[PDB]
Write a protein that binds this ligand. Sequence first.
Ligand code: ADP
Ligand code: ADP
Ligand code: MG
Ligand code: MG
Ligand code: MG
Lengths: 370, 370, 187, 159, 159, 159
Amino acid sequence: TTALVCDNGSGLVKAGFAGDDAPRAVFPSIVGRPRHQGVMVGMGQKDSYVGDEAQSKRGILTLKYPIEHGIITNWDDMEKIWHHTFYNELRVAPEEHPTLLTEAPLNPKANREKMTQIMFETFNVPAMYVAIQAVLSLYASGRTTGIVLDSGDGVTHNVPIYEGYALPHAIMRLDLAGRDLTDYLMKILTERGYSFVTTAEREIVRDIKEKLCYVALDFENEMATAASSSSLEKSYELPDGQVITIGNERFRCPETLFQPSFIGMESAGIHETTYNSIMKCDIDIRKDLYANNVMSGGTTMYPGIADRMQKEITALAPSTMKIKIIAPPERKYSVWIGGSILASLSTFQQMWITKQEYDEAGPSIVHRKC
Amino acid sequence: TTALVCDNGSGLVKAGFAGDDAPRAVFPSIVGRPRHQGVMVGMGQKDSYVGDEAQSKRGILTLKYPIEHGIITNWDDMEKIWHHTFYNELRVAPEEHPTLLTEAPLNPKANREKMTQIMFETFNVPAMYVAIQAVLSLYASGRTTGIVLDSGDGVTHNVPIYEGYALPHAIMRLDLAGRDLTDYLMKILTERGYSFVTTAEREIVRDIKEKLCYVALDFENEMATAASSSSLEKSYELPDGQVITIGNERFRCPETLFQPSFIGMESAGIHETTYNSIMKCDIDIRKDLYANNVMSGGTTMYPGIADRMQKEITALAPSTMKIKIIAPPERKYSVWIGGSILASLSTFQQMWITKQEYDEAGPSIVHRKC
Amino acid sequence: YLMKILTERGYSFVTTAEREIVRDIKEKLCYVALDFENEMATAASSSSLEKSYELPDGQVITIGNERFRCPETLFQPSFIGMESAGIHETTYNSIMKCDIDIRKDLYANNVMSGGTTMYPGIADRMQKEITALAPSTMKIKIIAPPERKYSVWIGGSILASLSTFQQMWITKQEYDEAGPSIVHRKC
Amino acid sequence: IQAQIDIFKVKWDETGNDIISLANNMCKIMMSMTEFTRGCGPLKTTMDVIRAAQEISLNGSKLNALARQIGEESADSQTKKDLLAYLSQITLYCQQLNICSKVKADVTQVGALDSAMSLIQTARNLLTAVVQTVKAAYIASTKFRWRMAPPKKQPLIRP
Amino acid sequence: IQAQIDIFKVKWDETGNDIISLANNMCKIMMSMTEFTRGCGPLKTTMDVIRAAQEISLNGSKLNALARQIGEESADSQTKKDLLAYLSQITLYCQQLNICSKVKADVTQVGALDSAMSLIQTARNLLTAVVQTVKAAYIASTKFRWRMAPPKKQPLIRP
Amino acid sequence: IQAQIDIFKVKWDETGNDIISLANNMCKIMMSMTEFTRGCGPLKTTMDVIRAAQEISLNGSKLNALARQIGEESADSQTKKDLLAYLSQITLYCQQLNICSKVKADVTQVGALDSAMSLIQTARNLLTAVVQTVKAAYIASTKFRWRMAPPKKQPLIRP
Ligand SMILES: Nc1ncnc2c1ncn2[C@@H]1O[C@H](COP(=O)(O)OP(=O)(O)O)[C@@H](O)[C@H]1O
Ligand SMILES: Nc1ncnc2c1ncn2[C@@H]1O[C@H](COP(=O)(O)OP(=O)(O)O)[C@@H](O)[C@H]1O
Ligand SMILES: [Mg+2]
Ligand SMILES: [Mg+2]
Ligand SMILES: [Mg+2]
């Protein structure tokens, strides 16, 4: 039949049908459960709200993400999320569709083994496949030679590829991503007086970060400009009518990516991580990797991240090489479009993990096949 | 000269001279104003009573705390409180003494900026300094490596420190403190029949909480014991001769700290907050932070809070590590004793914010210096 | 590489202090397998190879298959993306670059030094790997003193205290005359 | 709310037509009352709004019975539990509509728009809990052991 | 890339003309898009570049089918394996061109040069994998059991 | 801690004897308080532990003054900077010992082992920062322009 492509990220679930060019279902990956006391009979029978129905009712729920840093910490909640995706959002019986799941590199092996076991034993899919996300982003970028920075909500990882041959020793996975930026924005928002503490208020702060925050080209000059004048202050209106105003927190939140010492992490920024991943590859392909820096994932959509990253890498690379960062306008959905390209290929249809193979070899077949 | 150490908490003001070992003035931080009608000529000329003279006359006043959750909401009243502290209680001219003020972490920046401006423009102090409270508690605890739980009347915050190097990304400030426990005690006291509604009756309920309330080691077993028999009931005598009797409300009021869902708050208890603050620090120092859990502040003086907190943390920490909670008998005044230790140091006398520096750089010098 | 393959089980060490923790794990637990494929089969079939280590904060880890995969990088440097041949082929190639008459004497004296050559079972494995390359007649034996971590320093003690050697120091007067380029002539 | 029903195209397939017809009648009456709110509509007297509310309540009882039959026909799953929750909500809303309609009728007889505002609100709550009852019933009866079109593609760029 | 086809002069000789014609059309469209990159060319709108990319993809599918027919007609050899590898590459590039063209069309419709840069890159990859498919197919069908001129003399002294 | 002083055998050689004597007194009092912790020792009352802590603080002030004199006598180097850092640490520890001893005295007078635990901890921190002050002062005064034996041989095999 037609294959499903479920890109269950750490923050958003993006599902669809293979061969298309856009997902059908795009909903947050949360599972709320009511915490207050129900007083009207018949209201309160539903124990847990999943996805978009827990984002509307978040005033009386404790939203809990099942996937946390790309690793599925809670498995019952993630079964709930997958059931929602298959039946209530896409409205397809899984028994008739192969499913192409995505996964960050360098995750635990139990993660793939349990995703395979759940798909083949609970949802009874006829076939499946687990693909690294940056490979799919390079599929959807229309190339075969690049270094794929793939931020997100859970992790931020690079995968350098030269002409279809990935270099597994130069894959650099960093655990700094959108959720850490949300928490840091909450922290620095406490300075102005605004205290967001609950989970629903985490979602409000996430929306503030998406709407207002941007990346400064030169950090010190922008701090000087923000301190000298109030030209950088922009106002946001909370769900209860209150108006906030953040002037200096706008570029301090996404600067955590380039200086992960803001949140106490030791590792180098994403620019030094990309450059170190480039100079771990063979000398002959560094020129081709410099010119194709595919950026993917949601977190790489801050206004001004491509220019800043080009400036930061150009100061590290030799003066001769041509650095240019590829930032497609649709880069939030690049992984899923790559899943559509991969799952609908004529060549690929011999690479599904069929149910018969899983019955023969158990959940450890995913390590051989994928 | 000799430096002042004014630890203006959210509920009590504790001032003194640096180098001593006990405060000179310890009075509540309230500012009452009469609300009834004066009928005798010459009585009623005084518009507002501050501190201890508003706690004696509380029968005809509306007591209002100027500091509320560690953040100074009312500034004229807090000028009144500081004037009282300097002139009527300590009896010193501020022009001749540097002042060491204290402040909870993660407060607004306008708070420090306006405390500095008021001290340098209204009281004309020659120097000042604003110090985080848990750092001073660790000073006064006689160590340099611990995690300082510092409850109080406004806030409850942790500051993990390893060998004089604080970890600012693991500071966990919780806004649940003594005043919320007082309000919850009023709420649960309404069950027995006693209705305290006014501010003076808030002070009566605060005294009930201090005298009678304690923390249960095992909550369910203590509820079972309290329901089965009347061995837990203790009586208190109100200021008009009436006798109350609270048996089950004794350990339900301070249980709000370990289950903040009693008062509708979502956040985790103080035991989970301390453990989360420990496992945000670097792996090598968690063993040293486990063994030094300095507890400070007034609210941590319930009978049985050290044993209960040790039991709650030991169930979270690995079975090998040695958990022990440090609860000095003087822990109500630990922050001020730390202020005495810090302000009287030979090394420290180059770190005051001198008046000349404030004249040069304005009230934004406190962010650089402190 | 041990940090990389430890990420598979779930343990993520990222900082420098955690590099030192992983180094201690490598020293305590890791060893070299005599036959790699047979040991992988044994490790997959049963849990007899799993050994536990306790981190500085009380947590307990458990590595069963990463024990001999980390030091196997020496004999297959393609694990970490390097092209060059293992230490056994490097030693054999260094032997057959020497003159034909001395290869028999070099085969029988394979002195192993340095810290990294102290994995339990590296001498037996290296002897097995070289013996499969050398002619069937020659006698291969690897010399692995128990103190081989400090062999270089003990050699420094032997060399610096010799009666003959005291004319070979680079004296300060010679350095003043000839500059820092004297070390290339003398050494 | 109308769009969720409008994606239906022609256990289930035995009692499905009845349920979809009832939901369509509900939506028709609902926008009748909404147009009354906006000023221009088929019904113009508050008595007419009360009659329409009672009609919606009757349709709600009928649809509740049909969906309960489908729910006990089906097998244990998560969608069955969602369906039962929505059935309880429909029961509460129908009882509210009945009693409040009678109360508003008496209030109007003893001697305006705000009288019908709460009836419109309760009927709108009822309708929102029906379009989630037809979908849950359809999925529980069909996908587990009419039609609904697959959802439309989400925009790649949102302006 | 054009020169490799330009050395063709007039199994193979039955389906050869179709393949050479398809490759020539590909090169013509390719330099159309290249001239768009340089600024002056037959097509000036990004929509035109997307249409050209879809056209190249269609030609790629046709040439892939023809070359597969020649490949299974021929006998086992090394050039046959090279031909099959290049056919797989053409398949991947055609799928990329299709889906990416649709995505860029939607992105442009929802509301510049960098939008067409990746389409040009993918089409150029496709073209490079065709001039190695015509040569491998020609050799596999002919030399084993149109024309290509013998290669030019290499310079004796390279300045 | 005792072993680091015990390797001392008989600027420096003018004020060295005073510093080594002060450090030895510190260690003697330190194990006095340690033996109090273990149960059996010269001093058995918490008041005695407070007196011992005040004595250690006084010795710390004296040794700080002597080491500061040596430090300003000596020349610029890295060991001088280490010595100054350790002097600052000694100053902090002495201030802590003074004020905390007074506080514990008042607490005990107003009416057990845990009262002396923190005093023992602070005195132990002070002592650890002294054996690194005598060594740094000795090296800064002597090696740059009593005695300490060369370090013992490290084991070749560690079981
Ligand atoms: N327009 C935007 N600007 C800045 N950050 C964004 C934007 N959109 C999304 N994000 C961040 O990206 C995250 C979503 O990334 P996503 O594409 O879902 O990655 P994944 O699918 O791997 O979770 C959100 O948590 C949000 O913080
Ligand atoms: N003995 C006690 N038992 C229980 N709670 C107490 C006791 N003493 C004080 N408290 C609580 O602590 C609060 C005073 O804390 P305090 O030490 O003043 O902190 P801060 O100085 O930061 O305000 C009071 O509001 C009271 O509720
Ligand atoms: Mg993603
Ligand atoms: Mg306090
Ligand atoms: Mg060595």
